[PDB]
Every structure is written in C-alpha cells, then in structure tokens.
Amino acid sequence: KEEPINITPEELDASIDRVTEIMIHDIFSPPVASRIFAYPNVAAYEIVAATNDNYNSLAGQLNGLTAIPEPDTTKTINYELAAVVAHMELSKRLIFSEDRMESLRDSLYMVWEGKNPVLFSDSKAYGLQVADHIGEWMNKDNYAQTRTMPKDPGRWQPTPPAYMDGIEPHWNKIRPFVLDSAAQFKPVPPPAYSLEEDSAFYKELKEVYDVRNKITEEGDSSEEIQIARFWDCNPYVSKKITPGAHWMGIAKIAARKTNSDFAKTLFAYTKASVAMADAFISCWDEKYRSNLIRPETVINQHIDDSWKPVLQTPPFPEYTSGHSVVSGAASVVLTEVFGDNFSFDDDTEVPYGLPIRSFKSFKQAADEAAISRMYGGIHYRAAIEVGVKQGRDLGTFVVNKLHMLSDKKV
Ligand code: NA
Numbered sequence: 001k002e003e004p005i006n007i008t009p010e011e012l013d014a015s016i017d018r019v020t021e022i023m024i025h026d027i028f029s030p031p032v033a034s035r036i037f038a039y040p041n042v043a044a045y046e047i048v049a050a051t052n053d054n055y056n057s058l059a060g061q062l063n064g065l066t067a068i069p070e071p072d073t074t075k076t077i078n079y080e081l082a083a084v085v086a087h088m089e090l091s092k093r094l095i096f097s098e099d100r101m102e103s104l105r106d107s108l109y110m111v112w113e114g115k116n117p118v119l120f121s122d123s124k125a126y127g128l129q130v131a132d133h134i135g136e137w138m139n140k141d142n143y144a145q146t147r148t149m150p151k152d153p154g155r156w157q158p159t160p161p162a163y164m165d166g167i168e169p170h171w172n173k174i175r176p177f178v179l180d181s182a183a184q185f186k187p188v189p190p191p192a193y194s195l196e197e198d199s200a201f202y203k204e205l206k207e208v209y210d211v212r213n214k215i216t217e218e219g220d221s222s223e224e225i226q227i228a229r230f231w232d233c234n235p236y237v238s239k240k241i242t243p244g245a246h247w248m249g250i251a252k253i254a255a256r257k258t259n260s261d262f263a264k265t266l267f268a269y270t271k272a273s274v275a276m277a278d279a280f281i282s283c284w285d286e287k288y289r290s291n292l293i294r295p296e297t298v299i300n301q302h303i304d305d306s307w308k309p310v311l312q313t314p315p316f317p318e319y320t321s322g323h324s325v326v327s328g329a330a331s332v333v334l335t336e337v338f339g340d341n342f343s344f345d346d347d348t349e350v351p352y353g354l355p356i357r358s359f360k361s362f363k364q365a366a367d368e369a370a371i372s373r374m375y376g377g378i379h380y381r382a383a384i385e386v387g388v389k390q391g392r393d394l395g396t397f398v399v400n401k402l403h404m405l406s407d408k409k410v
Contacts, residue, residue, distance in 0.1 A: 003115040005123075007080035009265035011108065012044065012087060013252055016269070018104045019091040020245050026096040027235060030242040030322055031171045031280040035143065037248055038177065038270075038277040040090035043068075043134040044083035045270040045404075047127070048263050051079040053408035055267060061402055062177045062274070065137055068130050075122040080262050081112065085127025090134060141175040149173075154193025154201075156291045156317035161238050164315035171284035177274045178398050182285045185394045187386045190290050190319040195302055204380040208295040209303060212310060212377045224375040228310050230354050231323060231372035237312050240352055243323050243369070244276045247330035249348035250365065254338045267404055268337045272330055275398040279329035282394050283322050283387065292318040295377060309377025320387030321379045324370040328391020329398070331366035336399045338362075366391075 016037070023033055042058060046068045049057040059067045071077050085105075092101035112120040149170050158164055172182040179185070191200035215224050233243045241249070251272045255265045294313045316322075334342070340361055347356045359365040370388045373379040 005078050005081055005112050005116055009262050011084050015087050022095045022097050022100050029167045031168050031284055033242045034244040034277040034280045036094045038273040039138045040087040041270040041273045043086040043090050043131055045266050047079055047083040048266055052263050056404055056406045068133050071126050077126050078123045081123040082127035085124050086131040089131040142173050146170045146173050154293055156293050157297050159313040167316045169288050176278050176281050178401055179278050182281050185282045185390050187390045190292055190382050209299055227372045228376040230357055231369045232311050234314050243326045246348050253344050272333045275329045275333045275395050276326050279326045279391050279394055283325035286320050287317040290319045294318050311376035311378055313378045319383040320390050321373050321383040323373055324384050324387030325391035327366035327369040328388045329395035331362040332392050332395030334362045
C-alpha cells in the first residue's frame with residue numbers, strides 16, 4: 001500500500017476556505033482575521049523553503065522567527081502533505097470552533113492514510129513538528145496578553161444601531177511580522193475637527209453628506225450602491241467576510257488563473273497575508289492615535305438628523321480606513337507577484353449574496369475598495385486617500401524587505 005499522494009494547491013485553498021467560513025461563524029473582527037491567515041501560511045511556507053531551493057526561509061526575516069526543524073533524512077516525506085498538515089493544525093488552533101477544522105482535516109487524512117499509510121504517517125509527523133515550532137513563536141506575539149488589557153468633541157463615539165465599544169484598541173501592541181514598529185507607517189494627521197464652513201474638516205464632512213444624497217437622487221439601481229455593498233465586508237452588520245479575507249480570495253483567483261504550482265501559490269499567499277497582518281497593525285495604530293469621529297455622528301448631531309449612510313458604520317474610529325490600508329498593501333504585493341495589468345473576475349462575494357465584479361488590475365480593485373467607503377458614507381476623503389498611501393507604502397516596504405523567491409539555477 002504505497003501509492004503516491006498528490007497534493008495540489010487546491011488542498012491549501014480548502015483549508016483557507018474552511019477557516020474563512022469558521023471565522024464568520026465565530027465572529028472574528030477584521031484585524032484578528034489577518035492574524036489567523038498569516039501564521040498557518042508561514043508554517044507551510046517554511047516547509048516549502050526548507051525543501052525547495054527556489055524559495056528562501058523567512059527565518060531571520062520575520063520578527064522573532066527562527067529556523068524550523070529539518071525533516072528526518074531517513075524517512076520518505078511528502079513535503080506538500082506536511083505543509084497542508086501544518087496549515088490545518090495552526091488554523092485549528094487560531095479559531096474557536098476547532099471541530100469544524102478537524103472535520104475537513106479528518107476527511108483528507110482518511111483518504112491519504114488509505115492510499116499510503118507510511119508516507120502519511122511520516123509526513124503528518126513532520127507537519128505537526130513544524131506547527132509546534134511555529135506555534136511557540138505565534139504564542140509570543142502579545143495577542144494572549146492583549147485579551148484582558150483594560151478598556152475633544154471630535155473624539156470617536158460609538159454609533160447606532162448597536163453602539164458597540166471600539167474593536168481592538170490595542171491591536172498596535174501585537175508583534176508585527178516585518179515592521180520595525182507598529183508606528184513605522186504613521187500617516188499625516190487627519191484634518192482638525194471643525195464645524196467652520198471654510199475648514200478642511202467641514203469640506204470633507206460635506207462631501208460625505210452630499211455624495212450620499214446624490215446616491216439617494218439616483219435610486220437603488222446605482223452603481224455606487226453596488227460598489228459599497230460589494231466591498232462592505234463588515235461582520236457587525238445588524239454572513240459576511242472581512243477585507244483581509246476578500247484579498248485572500250483575490251490572491252487565490254490570481255494563483256488559480258496562472259496555474260501556479262503548490263510552492264508558487266504558497267509564496268504568494270504568504271507574502272500577501274504577512275503584509276496584510278502588518279497593514280492592520282499600522283492602520284489600527286493610527287485609528288486609536290487620532291480616535292476620530294465617524295461621519296454619521298457629526299452629520300446627525302450638527303447638520304441633518306434624518307441622514308443615514310448607505311452602509312452601517314463599523315465600530316471603530318475613522319482614520320485611516322482599514323479597507324484602504326489593507327487593499328493598498330495587498331495590491332502592492334499581488335502586483336509584485338503576479339504583475340500589473342492583471343485582469344480578473346472577482347467571484348469572492350458570490351457566496352455572500354453579491355454578483356461578480358471584473359477588474360483590469362489589482363490596483364484598480366484596491367482603488368474601488370477605497371472609494372466604496374465614500375459611497376458607503378462611513379469614511380471621509382482623507383481616511384481613504386491617506387489610507388491607500390499608507391498601505392501602498394507599507395506593502396512596498398514588505399516587498400523590498402522580504403527575500404523569498406530566489407531561483408536555484410540564477
Ligand atoms: Na529553500
């Protein structure tokens with residue numbers, strides 16, 4: 001009983017799709033979701049790097065990460081199999097409903113164990129050894145400690161309908177993967193809160209107000225409303241994926257469209273997920289520095305008590321926009337991996353109630369994701385424009401810092 005086990009990139013995708021689904025169920029927030037995607041990819045990628053002379057190890061490149069154990073030269077191991085095992089095991093550790101990862105895992109294990117028990121056993125064992133190593137490092141990143149950390153008129157207020165307390169005030173205290181510090185990409189400050197009619201703040205408030213009213217005047221056909229809903233990606237609305245998950249989905253689309261092999265797929269997902277996790281830290285750092293009031297609050301208190309945004313306002317401060325920062329970063333990474341002018345059909349939102357939208361490039365998609373927040377009535381211009389810059393600057397740094405691809409024969 002010694003058939004080969006063919007591991008394909010679609011099995012990695014299976015793990016990431018299941019964790020995605022579980023995240024929705026367990027009600028993970030946008031920044032916490034980015035941490036769930038990153039660590040399991042790093043573990044799998046390290047397995048690949050240790051065994052493929054075209055890819056360099058991230059040990060020594062990511063903060064605190066040391067070399068993984070090498071595989072036993074006396075055993076025949078299928079390294080892709082080990083990489084999938086590592087990915088699933090860490091993914092399971094990072095969500096609450098572990099039984100839902102275990103079901104996916106056990107169903108793969110049963111076929112593998114059935115075809116080649118010895119290869120399966122040796123390969124699983126190595127995958128689990130690596131997951132333990134990577135688990136030790138992930139458990140030193142300050143997430144556990146921040147779980148029980150204690151909790152002008154421009155200050156952010158919780159917003160209706162739910163008036164939830166701000167999400168993840170201390171996300172800036174998580175260990176970044178690549179950044180030298182959480183604040184490395186701190187942006188310029190937002191315009192000073194002001195109700196003076198000639199002020200920069202008031203101009204931007206008036207823009208939010210006016211855009212929403214133009215959308216009203218066009219009616220519910222309007223393309224703006226479709227764009228706002230496509231990118232909304234807010235699990236607190238009173239079944240949706242977060243923005244990091246959506247970009248993980250675009251990374252998958254690109255990898256499948258290019259017929260990228262297991263190693264190239266993992267490379268891409270790892271570079272993207274690491275960048276996004278650092279993008280959330282950078283963006284949340286600024287959110288809780290500037291702690292800026294959301295547009296509906298100022299509009300309903302000072303301008304028009306009947307006005308409502310197209311989208312529900314997320315429960316966290318305004319500046320800079322998460323969508324803008326994370327899309328900026330992700331766009332830069334995918335452009336670097338798969339190229340500019342990469343056209344694609346984005347079907348990531350089809351299982352979540354939406355149609356397909358087509359794009360001519362990752363840059364174009366990011367630009368749409370950023371302006372969707374203006375159509376949505378929940379961000380001012382500065383949070384969007386400055387946020388895209390912040391994410392593109394951060395994603396540039398990540399791509400310039402991480403040396404992963406390194407062809408054996410050049
Ligand atoms: Na290598």
